[model samples]
Target: SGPSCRFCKDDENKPCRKCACHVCGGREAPEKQLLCDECDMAFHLYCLKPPLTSVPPEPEWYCPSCRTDSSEVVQAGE
Candidate 1:
């Protein structure tokens, strides 16, 4: 959907429920959790989870959340 998120261009599932960052492949978010390396948009992998193990995918493969140059992550302060 969104201009940056290309879940359809790649023929991905509809109503993209994978809540992953479109940059970093970190599956922290369960809803719409997909790991996009380009735009760093979250996509649900459980909807389509890959690299099931802890070996970690290649570095070049970035998750949706970590693939941004402008997006700032809000850290939780205790």
Candidate 2:
């Protein structure tokens, strides 16, 4: 119950089945998935709303959900 899979622990579910894309629930290859450093969730860059050609060569990349700007929207944090 200490450590087994990456996200699975002795707390909640045994086998974590939440690895699917948070955006479109697209079951893509592991190599094609992009893990967000902030949320630790895997998502495909091409599965996004507008889609992305490739991963940026920058310092950080936040997912659309994680990168949402509450200030930009009129009704946010609802």
lDDT (CA) for every model shown? 0.48, 0.65
For residues 28-57, write the lDDT of model 2, one tens digit per residue. 666667777877677887776567778768
What is residue 57's positional error in candidate 2, in angstroms? 0.6
Q: Residue-wise lDDT of candidate 1 within 35-73, one digit each (tens)?
A: 456755555444333433342456655543354477876
Q: Which stretches of candidate 2 lie over 4 Å from their true place?
A: 1-16, 71-78
Model 1, 54: alpha-carbon shift in Å? 5.4
TM-score per model over all chains = 0.24, 0.54
User: What lDDT would candidate 2 get against the real structure?
Assistant: 0.65
